[PDB]
Chain A
Amino acid sequence: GHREEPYLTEAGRDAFDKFCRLHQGELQLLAGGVLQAPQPVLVKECELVKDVLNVLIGVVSATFSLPESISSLLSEVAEYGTCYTRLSHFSLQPKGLVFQAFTSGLRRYLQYYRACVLSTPPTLSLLTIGFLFKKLGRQLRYLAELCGVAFPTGVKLLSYLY
Chain B
Amino acid sequence: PDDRSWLEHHVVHQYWTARPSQFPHSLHLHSNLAAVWDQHLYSSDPLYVPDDRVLVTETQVIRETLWLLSGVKKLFIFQLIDGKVTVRNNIIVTHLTHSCLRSVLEQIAAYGQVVFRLQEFIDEVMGPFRTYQAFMWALYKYFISFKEELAEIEK
Contacts and interface: CB of A to CB of B under 8 A. Distances in A.
In the complex, A touching B (Cβ < 8 A): yes
Interface string A1-45: 010111110010001001101100100000000000000000000
Residue of B10, B12, B24, B60 with most chain A CB atoms under a 10 A cut-off: B10
B10 A6 contact: yes
Interface residues of B, number: 12
A11 B10 contact: yes
B3 A6 contact: no
Q: Which interface residue of A2, A11, A18 has the most chain B CB atoms within 10 A?
A: A18
A31 B3 CA distance: 19
A6 B60 CA distance: 12
B3 A5 contact: no
Contacts of A15: 6, 10
Interface residues of A, number: 13
Contact of A18 (B3, B12, B60): B3
B3 A7 contact: no
B13 interface: yes
A19 B6 CA distance: 10
A19 to B, nearest CB: 7
Contact of A21 (B3, B9, B12, B24): B3
B24 A7 contact: no
B61 to A, nearest CB: 12
Contacts of B13: 7-8
B31 to A, nearest CB: 14
Contacts of B59: 4
Contacts of A8: 7, 11, 13
Interface of A: 2, 4-8, 11, 15, 18-19, 21-22, 25
Interface of B: 2-3, 6-7, 9-13, 24, 59-60
23 contacts: A2-B24, A4-B60, A5-B9, A5-B10, A5-B11, A5-B12, A6-B10, A6-B11, A7-B11, A7-B12, A7-B13, A8-B7, A8-B11, A8-B13, A15-B6, A15-B10, A18-B3, A18-B6, A19-B3, A21-B2, A21-B3, A22-B3, A25-B3
